């Protein structure tokens, strides 16, 4: 006599090839549906009625151009449930209305919650501190700010990113032309965290691999390591001296080193999420007012900042009619901004 | 400015070496956070509740400062056992190789678009039964590229093609 | 008063000073342009 | 250039207040008994 809850807990936490856990009850269906929804949509489903776009292998797109695209702007921020008032239970119409986008976004969100819960659950069962879960808060902040908060601030899900390779590239250029997102210091901190994280990844791996102790006779040195060994496999002292003499400073504390490798990319992604939350409201770092006052009064004053705004104005005018079809933009040839000859 | 003009003139976003570059820096950041979090997760208790755990490691000590078997036991259960590194030399070679190769390809992207072998062009690749173009997201990218093209260096071109 | 037993000394080592000053100065170098606008 | 007149005081205090906080903590760590 144990009690069904404890008996279920036993079975959920059995040491098996794929750990399940309580968290798996949330994780596995939502991850599978998000992934399955994306594969289904990119293989078979159009974007003709929401965007005027082909978007599936069935229509002739390739891996770079397929997408599961956002619903039409006229849907607003509708949850677009299969049984909701828009599709009314019709699976085919639901697909044509963009229901697979909210299907993927929402199962994806709950799947990410399930995964972070899995990180906590496994850490607790194995007895390690849950820093991997904490580091994962950065992917979650990015997904939530970009795929949920940003469209929720705009007119509709239509302006969220569509789930596709080229669709995402379009999202990047939209953010340049409309938000001047490269000028945003929260994006800049994000860039620093990503490139700084990649730098730390490379330099730490390279440093370990080139300060190894000779622990075997092979010219291939991977075999000379034992997971249960007590000794460091590389020389922290020699690594510290090398970088001190090359670069001026070096790590001396292995624990700080590895925390810093987490801190840098995690903090960078968190900062980029904050900037996108601002962009949800069009609270852009779009301009420098002093630059605009000077340039408006002085037609000989030019900087790279004013040069990039001209590019943005080109992006907006030339991409908006096809990119925002619900607006029914007709821009006669004569109003399109353009330089000489081109 | 360099980046935006480059996109109009080479469609670098649609070039697979820039894609490998992005995988390099996204993946490098991911693996940095992963490696950092797994080692931090399994530090051996060597400090009191007051002091920073960083004092639990002394510069130049001979013994490892974390339990790599504990770290592997967590990560092998997070995904599956054989997806996890138990060999620290293999692990750190991978940490070196992934961003380095990714950035090699990024650099080769710029260095070969330097000779105008440009990103994939699927402009008007999808056509209906009559012959009407059915736009894809690639065509929306092209509209942004054109907007950059016509505006950049607005007084510098006298002839219809920007050939360099 | 009788002494409070929950007090603890606080520490900031030199490396942490250098890291913190670097963070602050670089954040200031980054954000100052937007403050002047 | 017609910059915002509060940009100078904003930047100065942004630098000074947290830098001073760290200097206070560092110096009083050094002065503790070794």
């Amino acid at each position: 006599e144990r009690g069904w809850f404890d008996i279920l807990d036993d079975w959920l936490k059995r040491d098996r090839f794929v750990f399940v856990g309580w968290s798996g009850i949330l994780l596995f269906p939502c991850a599978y549906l998000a992934l399955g929804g994306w594969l289904t949509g990119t293989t078979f489903v159009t974007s003709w009625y929401t965007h005027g776009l082909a978007s599936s292998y069935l229509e002739g797109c390739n891996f770079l151009t397929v997408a599961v695209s956002t619903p039409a702007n006229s849907m607003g921020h509708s949850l677009l449930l299969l049984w909701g008032p828009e599709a009314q239970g019709d699976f085919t119409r639901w697909c044509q209305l963009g229901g697979l986008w909210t299907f993927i976004a929402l199962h994806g969100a709950f799947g990410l919650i399930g995964f972070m819960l899995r990180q906590f659950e496994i850490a607790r069962l194995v007895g390690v501190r849950p820093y991997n879960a904490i580091a994962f808060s950065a992917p979650i902040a990015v997904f939530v700010s970009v795929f949920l908060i940003y469209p929720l601030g705009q007119s509709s899900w239509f302006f969220a990113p569509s789930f596709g390779v080229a669709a995402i590239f379009r999202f990047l250029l939209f953010f340049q032309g409309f938000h001047n997102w490269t000028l945003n210091p929260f994006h800049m901190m994000g860039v620093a965290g990503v490139l700084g994280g990649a730098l730390l990844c490379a330099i730490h791996g390279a440093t370990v691999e080139n300060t190894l102790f000779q622990d075997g006779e092979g010219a291939s040195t991977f075999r000379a390591f034992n997971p249960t060994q007590a000794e460091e496999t590389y020389s922290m002292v020699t690594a510290n001296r090398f970088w001190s003499q090359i670069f001026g400073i070096a790590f001396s504390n292995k624990r700080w080193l590895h925390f810093f490798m987490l801190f840098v990319p995690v903090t960078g992604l968190w900062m980029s999420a904050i900037g996108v939350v601002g962009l949800a409201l069009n609270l852009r770092s779009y301009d420098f007012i002093s630059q605009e006052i000077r340039a408006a009064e002085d037609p000989e004053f030019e900087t790279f900042y004013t040069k990039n705004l001209l590019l943005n104005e080109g992006i907006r005018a030339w991409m908006a009619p096809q990119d925002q079809p619900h607006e029914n933009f007709v821009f006669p040839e004569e109003v399109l901004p353009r330089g000489n000859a081109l | 400015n360099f980046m935006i003009v480059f996109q109009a003139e080479h469609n670098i976003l649609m070039h697979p070496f820039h894609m490998l570059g992005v995988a390099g820096v996204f993946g490098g950041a991911l693996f940095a956070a992963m490696h950092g979090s797994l080692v931090t997760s399994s530090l051996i208790r060597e400090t009191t509740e007051t002091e920073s755990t960083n004092y639990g490691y002394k510069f130049g000590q001979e013994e490892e400062t974390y339990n790599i078997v504990a770290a592997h036991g967590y990560f092998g259960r997070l995904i599956f056992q054989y997806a996890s590194f138990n060999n620290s030399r293999s692990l750190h070679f991978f940490l070196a190789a992934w961003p380095v190769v990714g950035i090699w390809f990024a650099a080769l992207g710029i260095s070969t678009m330097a000779f105008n072998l440009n990103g994939f062009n699927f402009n008007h690749s999808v056509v209906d039964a009559q012959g009407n173009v059915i736009n894809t997201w690639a065509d929306i990218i092209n509209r942004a590229n054109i907007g950059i093209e016509v505006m950049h260096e607005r007084n510098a071109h006298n002839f219809p093609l920007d050939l360099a | 008063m009788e002494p409070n037993p929950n007090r603890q000394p606080v520490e900031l080592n030199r490396t942490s000073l250098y890291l913190g000053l670097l963070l602050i100065l670089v954040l200031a170098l980054l954000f100052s342009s937007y403050f002047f606008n | 250039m017609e910059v915002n007149q509060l940009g100078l005081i904003a930047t100065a205090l942004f630098v000074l207040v947290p830098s001073v906080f760290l200097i206070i903590l560092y110096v009083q760590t050094e002065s503790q008994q070794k």
Binding site: - | - | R14, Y18, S32 | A12, V15
Partner: peptide
Amino acid sequence: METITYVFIFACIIALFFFAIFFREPPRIT
């Protein structure tokens, strides 16, 4: 005044580099 501010912060950073390298906490084996 804005140029002075930018150059001042930059100069403080370069000074910090100097102290961080030549007046670091010496790494010590124990």
